[PDB]
A paper describes a structure:
Human Carbonic Anhydrases (CAs, EC 4.2.1.1) catalyze the reversible conversion of carbon dioxide and water into bicarbonate and a proton via a coordinated metal ion, typically zinc. CAs dysregulation is linked to many diseases, including cancers expressing CA IX. With CA isoforms sharing similar structural features, designing CAIs to specifically target a single isoform has proved challenging. X-ray crystallography was used to determine the structures of both CA II and CA IX-mimic in the complex with three inhibitor compounds (3g, 3h, and 3j).
Of note, the pyridine containing derivatives 3g and 3h, which reported sub-nanomolar KI values of 0.30 and 0.24 nM, respectively, were thus the most potent CA IX inhibitors among the compounds reported. Compounds 3g and 3h have highly similar structures, similar binding patterns to CA IX-mimic, and similar affinity for CA IX over CA II. Compound 3g contains a 2-ureidobenzenesulfonamide and 3h contains a 1-ureido-benzenesulfonamide, relative to the heterocyclic pyridyl functional group. The pyridyl group is at a 107° angle (-NH-CH2-Py) in 3g and a 114° (-NH-CH2-CH2) angle for 3h, highlighting the similarity between the two high affinity complexes that exemplify a textbook case of isozyme-specific selectivity. The conformational freedom afforded by F131V in CA IX-mimic abates the energetic penalty of this polar–hydrophobic interaction and allows for the pyridine to maximize the much-preferred hydrophobic interactions between the carbon chain of the linker. Notably, 3g was observed to share a hydrogen bond with H64 in complex with CA II, an interaction not observed when binding to CA IX-mimic or by any other ligand binding to any other complex. Compound 3j’s affinity profile and binding conformation illustrate the imperative nature of targeting the selective pocket while 3g and 3h illustrate the profound impact on binding affinity that can be conferred by designing drugs that effectively leverage this site. All solved structures had a resolution range between 1.1 Å (CA IX-mimic and 3j) and 2.0 Å (CA IX-mimic and 3g) and were resolved to space group P 1 21 1. Mean I/σ ranged from 7.6 (CA IX-mimic and 3g) to 18.6 (CA II and 3j) and average temperature factors ranged from 18.3 Å2 (CA IX-mimic and 3h) to 27.4 Å2 (CA IX-mimic and 3g).
Numbering used by the authors: 4 to 125, 127 to 261
């Protein structure tokens, strides 16, 4: 029912998900001058060495690669996290044009896309219990800009033709998530929400300072995807991003001076 068009887009979501006007909603603009360097933060430790990708799926608002999370195979720990968070999926948000597409903004600058890597707190047992917890989820957000091609993205790009419309999935084994990470792991962090319905306020956002670059041909193939399912009017999947929400009583902390 909810979507990203004029009639079902982010400005209507509060009618079905009243938490959309809550206190810790996401995304936000990261004012880099008002973020506080916090030395009490630990380095991010990404242990994706034994990650097990399963499928890629068009869910009708994005495409999503899923992982086997029944074991500590790909985990995130450190940073502002307490405990161990298992990788569950990643997905992308992107625009119709290269000057918009990201959900988070940095000094009001929008990037061409955003990669979201979704992890959940193992102490809660499964992901459906974690999403009801104030600290149940950790999302690692990575900006994409348009420049040179990114090799570790090309395997995703090559299969997009197989999942063009909503509900299609394809096998997607032996994918390495480390190929999507920038060279530096400097980050901002703040407590937030999911950026799509149901917009649960369960996320510790970790947003990386350094973007990854992708080529225009690579992003062009993202925009060839469809919101609709097969046998329907053709709606290209673009501008699947929520606009920035007020920070309200929240401080953004930085891991880097
Ligand atoms: N962009 S995000 O903050 O990293 C993010 C991370 C994990 C998520 O699960 C979502 N949200 C969904 O996956 N919503 C599907 C759904 C829609 C309506 N009813 C039930 C389920 C957003
Ligand atoms: Zn997302």
């Amino acid at each position: 029912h909810w979507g990203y068009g004029k009639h079902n887009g982010p400005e209507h979501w509060h009618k079905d998900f009243p938490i959309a006007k809550g206190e810790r909603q996401s995304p936000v603009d990261i004012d880099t001058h008002t973020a506080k360097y916090d030395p009490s933060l630990k380095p991010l430790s990404v242990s994706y060495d034994q990650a097990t990708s399963l499928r890629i799926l068009n869910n009708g608002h994005s495409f999503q690669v899923t992982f086997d999370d029944s074991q500590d195979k790909a985990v995130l720990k450190g940073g502002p996290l307490d405990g161990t968070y298992r990788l569950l999926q990643f997905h992308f948000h992107w625009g119709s044009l290269d000057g918009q597409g990201s959900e988070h903004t940095v000094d009001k600058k929008k990037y061409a896309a955003e990669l979201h890597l979704v992890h959940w707190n193992t102490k809660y047992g499964d992901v459906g219990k974690a999403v009801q917890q104030p600290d149940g989820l950790a999302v690692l957000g990575i900006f994409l800009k348009v420049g040179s091609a990114k090799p570790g993205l090309q395997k995703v790009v090559d299969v997009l033709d197989s999942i063009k419309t909503e509900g299609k999935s394809a096998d997607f084994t032996n994918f390495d998530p480390r190929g999507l990470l920038p060279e530096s792991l400097d980050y901002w962090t703040y407590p937030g929400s999911l950026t799509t319905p149901p917009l649960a306020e369960c996320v510790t956002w970790i947003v990386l300072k350094e973007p990854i670059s992708v080529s225009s041909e690579q992003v062009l193939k993202f925009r060839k995807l469809n919101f609709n399912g097969e046998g329907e009017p053709e709606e290209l999947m673009v501008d699947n991003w929520r606009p920035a929400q007020p920070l309200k009583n929240r401080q953004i902390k930085a891991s880097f001076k």
